[PDB]
Ligand binder design. Sequence first.
Ligand SMILES: OC[C@H]1O[C@H](OC[C@H]2O[C@H](O)[C@H](O)[C@@H](O)[C@@H]2O)[C@H](O)[C@@H](O)[C@@H]1O
Ligand SMILES: OC[C@H]1O[C@H](OC[C@H]2O[C@H](O)[C@H](O)[C@@H](O)[C@@H]2O)[C@H](O)[C@@H](O)[C@@H]1O
Ligand SMILES: [Ca+2]
Lengths: 80, 1276, 148
Amino acid sequence: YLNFMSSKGLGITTTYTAATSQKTLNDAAFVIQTAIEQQISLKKSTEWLRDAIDSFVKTQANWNKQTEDEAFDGLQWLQG
Amino acid sequence: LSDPITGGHYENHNGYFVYIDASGKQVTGLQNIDGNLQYFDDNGYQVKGSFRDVNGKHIYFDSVTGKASSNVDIVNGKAQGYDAQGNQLKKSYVADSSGQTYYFDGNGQPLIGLQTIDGNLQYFNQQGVQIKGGFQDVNNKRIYFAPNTGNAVANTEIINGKLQGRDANGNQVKNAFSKDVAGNTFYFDANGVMLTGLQTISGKTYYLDEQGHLRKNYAGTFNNQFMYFDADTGAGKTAIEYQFDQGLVSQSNENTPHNAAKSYDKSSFENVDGYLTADTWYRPTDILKNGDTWTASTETDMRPLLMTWWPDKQTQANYLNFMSSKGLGITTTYTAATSQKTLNDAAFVIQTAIEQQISLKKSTEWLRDAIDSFVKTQANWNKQTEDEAFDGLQWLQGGFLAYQDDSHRTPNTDSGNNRKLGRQPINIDGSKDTTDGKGSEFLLANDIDNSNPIVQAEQLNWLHYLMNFGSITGNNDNANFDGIRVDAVDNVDADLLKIAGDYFKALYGTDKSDANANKHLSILEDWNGKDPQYVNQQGNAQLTMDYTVTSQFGNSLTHGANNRSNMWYFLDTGYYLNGDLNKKIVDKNRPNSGTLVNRIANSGDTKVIPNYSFVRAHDYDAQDPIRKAMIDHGIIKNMQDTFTFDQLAQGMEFYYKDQENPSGFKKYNDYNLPSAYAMLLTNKDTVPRVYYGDMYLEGGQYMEKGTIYNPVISALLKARIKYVSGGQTMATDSSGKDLKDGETDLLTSVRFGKGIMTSDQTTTQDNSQDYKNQGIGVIVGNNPDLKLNNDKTITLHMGKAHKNQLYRALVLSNDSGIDVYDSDDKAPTLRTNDNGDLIFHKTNTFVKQDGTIINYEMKGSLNALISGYLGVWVPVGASDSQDARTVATESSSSNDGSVFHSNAALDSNVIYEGFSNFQAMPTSPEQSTNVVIATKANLFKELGITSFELAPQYRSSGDTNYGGMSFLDSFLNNGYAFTDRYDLGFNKADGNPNPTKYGTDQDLRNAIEALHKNGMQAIADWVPDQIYALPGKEVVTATRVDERGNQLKDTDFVNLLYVANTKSSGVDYQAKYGGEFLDKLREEYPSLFKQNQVSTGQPIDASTKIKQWSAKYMNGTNILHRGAYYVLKDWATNQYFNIAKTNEVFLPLQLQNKDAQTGFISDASGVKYYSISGYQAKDTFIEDGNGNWYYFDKDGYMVRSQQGENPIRTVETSVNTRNGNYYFMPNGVELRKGFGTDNSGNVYYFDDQGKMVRDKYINDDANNFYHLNVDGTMSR
Amino acid sequence: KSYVADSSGQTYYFDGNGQPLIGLQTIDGNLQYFNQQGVQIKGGFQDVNNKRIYFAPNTGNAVANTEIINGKLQGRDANGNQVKNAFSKDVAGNTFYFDANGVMLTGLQTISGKTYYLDEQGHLRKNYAGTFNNQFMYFDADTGAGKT
Ligand SMILES: OC[C@H]1O[C@H](OC[C@H]2O[C@H](O)[C@H](O)[C@@H](O)[C@@H]2O)[C@H](O)[C@@H](O)[C@@H]1O
Ligand SMILES: OC[C@H]1O[C@H](OC[C@H]2O[C@H](O)[C@H](O)[C@@H](O)[C@@H]2O)[C@H](O)[C@@H](O)[C@@H]1O
Ligand SMILES: [Ca+2]
């Protein structure tokens, strides 16, 4: 999440890993939260954020078809 | 990346590699060390098999080497590729640590599922991994993906029990041919099932074997009627139609009488010994000047034979295409299949064009070059038909030809039934001719036939000329060589040793006394391990080398940074029974092994074989390293490569840098040279030899700069004079390969003094006192990381003749170098105990005799001068003029018949091999080797050199190269490669100076005299094996052979005519001095000329003198890259063209203005063939323009199979190499590289060239294996 | 300056001159060998100079490999030198270790202060857990080095 939001101009672009300390990630989440509220004031809208979250969510394997075992044999050929 | 560093060792701590700088500091971070990119964490340990982050880069390092390379990392949830520099890869394949392959797209994300890349179909699993070597159900189809590429291809699998076929798109195959991965083709019917046996499809017939494999290039009787299956598609032809496309046609026309030769002789034909060559030019009757008007030809007018005649249509077509390409006509694609008439017409339009460019340029040199070029294009006229090979001594120059005795075709070249090859010492009588014990007679250049008595006499003449060089060339009896080195002993007839030995006996009475023998020190380059025993049985006329000790230096000290044989191996304990050093019973029977001279307890009581020994030589541990260095730095590509002197100089700078590297690691150079010399120079029963290049740098100018080893070796040399004498012992702190807990494997070598032969001997038998201040102690290790246990003590048993005596160091190693002590006062002392032992501990406190206390650890060290330990100790109180040598006795000591004897007198000598093959050319006359030797003779006297081995002084053949590979001896002018054997630096005949690399002939005589003024002898390098770059051509009969003169197994180059360069100028010094001294010698010492030689049964023959070399006196030559058929031949009759004598002329009929008919013509009896030159083919193989081969029998008729009869025929031809069993089809075509069935159903196989194959396994491009019995049949 | 594969799958490389390259050659930094007819050797050993070299099945690129000399497996590196005192691979992907005398090692081996487990076939085992020292030991997925 931190890396994705960073890439969209919201902070220093970061390579964070699961190995990064919890404290660091939480601090970084807050600097992103700050930046978020600023672009909410600037745009007076949250639709830009809706789209950012939607996109980010589908990035993650637990939240997309990668954890759905897409297959195409038999009638599964039609829709996966 | 990161800037490179060198000069730091790698260290291992707790299972981890650390790297310590030249600075001496432990290294962290990313580092390029010697071209390898590596990383070390904060603690200084090296990372392997893990990813690290430096700057913007994600770099993996290898699991073995720790070197930066590509990998895939799972980063967060997802796979991402990375290169060697740590960049995320885009649109690239990467293989990970497990050898799995991903393809990452434009965004760097791996592709999944079916994909097409570079037009290749590939599949990827859901994790992004590439499927390779398997089937895969994707997109409602099954597809096989290839083992390594992973590309979609046809394949077969077995469904139920029936083979099924799958194509590239994953569809099953029905009604079609389809392959499998191995390469086999099958056919599958409408119901999908594979077909077997004979099948007709689409109006063509194919043969599928039991396995369903489509058989191509396969002959057999399938309809009980013959059928040949195509090499292209496997389609059956009846092989009834003749495939030759050339009917009998006449070639003569209106131009024939114009282009015919003016004359049938040497006037009108450029030739060698009467024969013609591809680049022969001839004189046509008339000339189409300017392409307009035929005009009679003047003598100067000459035209290339290839303008008008060709050996065959292939060559004709190639000539036309080549000349066309150079602006001479319509550029053409002609083949051998093109009609003869067309090619001939086209040759004439080219002839026209040629005469036009001759008028335009007013020259023919442009044409000379065009023909030369074209000729080398053709395989028959270049090395492709010479079977270039590089194994064995062939490594040097690419392979050898042996000349043959052939009075009918090549009589000037006949050797009179000489040319006995490989008569090396162990095979002097030919008794090992059929084994590897036959000598490698062929080494380099033109190998001289030293089995010929006439040649043997000439070699003696040359020998005499050298031994009297000064008397003969300067009337200076003090400028004569005293002794000889015999170059390449195992590559010549061993008679030469007897000839040389007997000569010395006759003229100097070397068999009379040790003083006579030793006044003419002489050595052998005799590498075979059985040569020492031979040389001794023959009375040691020249000193054998002792490779056994040179070899052990390689294994235990000189070679390799680490895993080295123990010093234990120097002892050769096997010498004694049961390896027992307490009991010391000599083992009278051993399995032909061990060192030549035992030195465990050498008291001089057992007779031993006299010898010289060395650590290095001009030709040992020099030529290879120096070139490896140039190769490693991109200065040349191959060892055989030609290099320039500047190229050598650049390489030499790296060589020197590596040699003197303070790290102590050496990549090209030898380790532990000081330690090796310390042993060499203290050993009893040997004449040691010292290599110039260990004392001075091997390149640049002579004696330009001393080496780092010079001080130490110089000290050892001067100490040898003062202290080295008496008996020897040698021991190691070691019992074998493997070391017990306390054991150091440190070698202790001791000499006792003049009359002292044993440890326990307390005094001389003659009561002389010389011994007390003589003797020496040497300690040496091969382990730079050697640390002693605190308790451990190491002892030098200096002997009971040296009780309670004070000893002082000559030489001591340490971590920065080796200290050298020039006199007693400047050195640490230490005193022997009551028993005469110097005891050493891990830690030592020595005292100087007057000055002070010194601390010293018995510690292995590592630096440019050593990798191990070295300590040498001498008795204090030695006189300044002390000399421990023994003078040689004038008395007849021995009735054994022998010349040299290993004893204290012989051991008092030292040879200096005073040159390097890689010296630069003298920049000025003043710096020429032999000038310098004269000014510096003094310096060598004081190192105890008694004989100076000078380089071979013969004039270098240089850059001259008549064909074939040049050798470094020649282009480096080192004197081993020479044109004139008697020119040792004489002036040009116009008066101008003409030095060798070493200086003029005067410089040589001055150098030799200077050495005699300083009591040293001068050694001549006697080089009888070969001679280089002879300017005259002759036609020999030659066979392609390996170093031992054995015909290569699969060669057609057998008894073929060849143009060789074998003839000397006849106006050279060899002409002046050749055989001149023999008459004088026969008069004065008759028995030399009456004594029989062993190999020949004959005495040497001075009745004929050699002023000019020629082929009849040679065994052969290195291949000259000219071709098997550069000497022109008619394919039809197999006779070679010739014009020497008008009674026996043979030319193509065109050139004699007769009608040449050429082609295939049928008659009632069978098919006949006429060559381009117009002769009928008989008893010869012939190739048509489409590439088919035929055999024409003695009667002149093509061989062909009849119905119901065996197609296999046994052929015995004029050309023997082609003898064998062939398979001819009904239309006469020979089967090649495929199987043929006989009339009875038996299958055989026939090779590349049509021959039947027997008694072996045979593999197939599709991995099918077949076996052929002895009778030829296939069991399979 | 291009590779071409012919009808039979044989591969040649043509230089600037157009003449097919013959003998040992380096291309795109890859070491390759060509017979006297200009054909590329793939999937086999070869003797060039003084060093025997294996060339890969598809690329033909020089790589480490093992062959059986007499009855003992031996190891050959990418430069064609036999391997002594080191780890070396074979084409299949297995790593072996060869001692000072060139002979492949077997079983539990400690080298350079680390412990590796080689099975009966001499294969270095990575990501392998077991207790054969009468003590537990996990052999690294990276290098096969034993950790506790
Ligand atoms: O461009 C060459 C090659 O690249 C990839 O294959 C690399 C590598 O894969 C395995 O290690 C094989 O055993 C080797 O022979 C290969 O060189 C691609 O997968 C392949 O399609 C491509 O040809
Ligand atoms: O070469 C003289 C040498 O011969 C025997 O040893 C042969 C050979 O044995 C090993 O394999 C060592 O690794 C080599 O260094 C040896 O040269 C004798 O036993 C030995 O004493 C002698 O020096
Ligand atoms: Ca010879």
